[PDB]
Write an enzyme that holds these catalytic residues in place. Structure first.
Site, short mmCIF file in Angstrom:
data_model
loop_
_atom_site.label_atom_id
_atom_site.label_comp_id
_atom_site.label_asym_id
_atom_site.label_seq_id
_atom_site.Cartn_x
_atom_site.Cartn_y
_atom_site.Cartn_z
N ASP A 1 0.81 -1.23 0.00
CA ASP A 1 0.00 0.00 0.00
C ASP A 1 0.83 1.26 0.00
O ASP A 1 1.32 1.74 1.03
CB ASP A 1 -0.91 -0.07 1.24
CG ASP A 1 -2.00 0.99 1.24
OD1 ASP A 1 -1.90 1.93 0.41
OD2 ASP A 1 -2.94 0.89 2.06
N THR A 2 1.07 1.88 -1.17
CA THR A 2 1.98 3.03 -1.14
C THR A 2 1.31 4.24 -0.50
O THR A 2 2.01 5.21 -0.20
CB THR A 2 2.45 3.44 -2.54
OG1 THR A 2 1.29 3.63 -3.36
CG2 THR A 2 3.27 2.29 -3.12
N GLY A 3 0.00 4.15 -0.34
CA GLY A 3 -0.77 5.23 0.29
C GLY A 3 -0.76 5.12 1.81
O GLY A 3 -1.38 5.93 2.50
C1 LIG Z 1 -12.68 1.65 -3.33
O1 LIG Z 1 -11.76 2.72 -3.49
C2 LIG Z 1 -11.05 2.96 -2.35
C3 LIG Z 1 -10.04 3.91 -2.39
C4 LIG Z 1 -9.33 4.22 -1.23
C5 LIG Z 1 -9.54 3.44 -0.10
S1 LIG Z 1 -8.59 3.79 1.34
O2 LIG Z 1 -9.38 3.39 2.55
O3 LIG Z 1 -8.24 5.24 1.34
N1 LIG Z 1 -7.22 2.89 1.32
C6 LIG Z 1 -7.45 1.50 1.01
C7 LIG Z 1 -7.48 0.63 2.27
C8 LIG Z 1 -6.60 0.87 3.32
C9 LIG Z 1 -6.66 0.10 4.47
C10 LIG Z 1 -7.60 -0.91 4.60
C11 LIG Z 1 -8.46 -1.17 3.54
C12 LIG Z 1 -8.40 -0.41 2.39
C13 LIG Z 1 -6.10 3.53 0.66
C14 LIG Z 1 -4.93 3.69 1.66
O4 LIG Z 1 -3.72 3.88 0.93
C15 LIG Z 1 -5.18 4.84 2.64
C16 LIG Z 1 -5.16 6.21 1.93
C17 LIG Z 1 -5.52 7.47 2.73
C18 LIG Z 1 -5.92 8.57 1.73
C19 LIG Z 1 -6.28 9.84 2.50
C20 LIG Z 1 -5.05 10.30 3.30
C21 LIG Z 1 -4.67 9.20 4.30
C22 LIG Z 1 -5.87 8.93 5.22
C23 LIG Z 1 -7.08 8.45 4.42
C24 LIG Z 1 -7.47 9.55 3.42
C25 LIG Z 1 -6.70 7.18 3.65
C26 LIG Z 1 -4.31 7.93 3.51
N2 LIG Z 1 -4.10 4.90 3.63
C27 LIG Z 1 -4.25 4.53 4.91
O5 LIG Z 1 -5.29 4.12 5.39
O6 LIG Z 1 -3.12 4.62 5.66
C28 LIG Z 1 -3.26 4.41 7.07
C29 LIG Z 1 -2.16 3.42 7.49
O7 LIG Z 1 -0.96 4.19 7.33
C30 LIG Z 1 -1.24 5.50 7.82
O8 LIG Z 1 -0.66 6.49 6.97
C31 LIG Z 1 -1.67 6.97 6.09
C32 LIG Z 1 -2.96 6.92 6.92
C33 LIG Z 1 -2.75 5.67 7.78
C34 LIG Z 1 -10.59 2.53 -0.03
C35 LIG Z 1 -11.36 2.28 -1.17
#
Ligand SMILES: COc1ccc(S(=O)(=O)N(Cc2ccccc2)C[C@@H](O)[C@H](C[C@]23C[C@H]4C[C@H](C[C@H](C4)C2)C3)NC(=O)O[C@H]2CO[C@H]3OCC[C@H]32)cc1
Ligand SMILES: [Cl-]
Ligand SMILES: [Cl-]
Lengths: 99, 99
Positions: free
Chosen positions: A25-27
């Site tokens: 997960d690069t996000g």
């Molecule tokens: C269907 O289309 C979708 C599109 C997006 C998503 S999502 O929930 O945004 N996620 C996918 C996902 C992640 C976890 C579990 C299941 C699915 C993407 C993650 O990369 C997400 C991004 C963001 C995008 C913005 C800015 C931040 C906070 C949120 C809004 C989620 C990262 N990053 C995250 O959660 O990081 C967390 C862990 O590391 C930490 O550091 C960063 C915050 C803490 C779900 C559905």
């Protein structure tokens, strides 16, 4: 490997002797794994995801194999819908984004 | 380009005539942009991650310029603090994860 993104970038991880599936997960700044038992002491951390903030348990210096590559670092444990490998460990395994 | 992951992989994008910063996010199925107007019809959608779900607007066939690379696809619009470019458009610019 070179991993394209037509499908979720799911890989096998090994932590605590157990195999699990996790999402590269690069996000994600941090690595977050579903409820499991880890050794040692943990510290509090609040993390923010798309739907809001959650409390997790922060374990430091945890050994974890990620698609065959050895990492040793911080693992957050808590109610994440899916196990995610974040940049803290992607950097350890030498991953980059390319286009 | 080759982007390292020591820091958040943020790029400049152009969407609906506006320039914006966005996170290249392999953990995101879909592209999710902070509140803005876009042309055309839309339908409501729920997306989930850590923290639970948010309601968004689904716009289909939207063009975006990502780091100077044109792409078209579905864009979700809703209450996120950070714009994210998800796999549905990462594929279109030929982005891969490498290690
Ligand atoms: C269907 O289309 C979708 C599109 C997006 C998503 S999502 O929930 O945004 N996620 C996918 C996902 C992640 C976890 C579990 C299941 C699915 C993407 C993650 O990369 C997400 C991004 C963001 C995008 C913005 C800015 C931040 C906070 C949120 C809004 C989620 C990262 N990053 C995250 O959660 O990081 C967390 C862990 O590391 C930490 O550091 C960063 C915050 C803490 C779900 C559905
Ligand atoms: Cl699409
Ligand atoms: Cl391809």
């Amino acid at each position: 490997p070179q991993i394209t993104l037509w499908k979720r970038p799911l890989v096998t991880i090994k932590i605590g002797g157990q195999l699990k599936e996790a999402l590269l997960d690069t996000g994600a700044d941090d690595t977050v794994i579903e409820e499991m038992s880890l050794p040692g002491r943990w510290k509090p951390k609040m993390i923010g995801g798309i739907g809001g903030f959650i409390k997790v348990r922060q374990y430091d210096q945890i050994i974890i194999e990620i698609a065959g590559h050895k990492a040793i670092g911080t693992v957050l444990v808590g109610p994440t819908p899916v196990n995610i490998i974040g940049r803290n460990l992607l950097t350890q395994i030498g991953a980059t984004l390319n286009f």
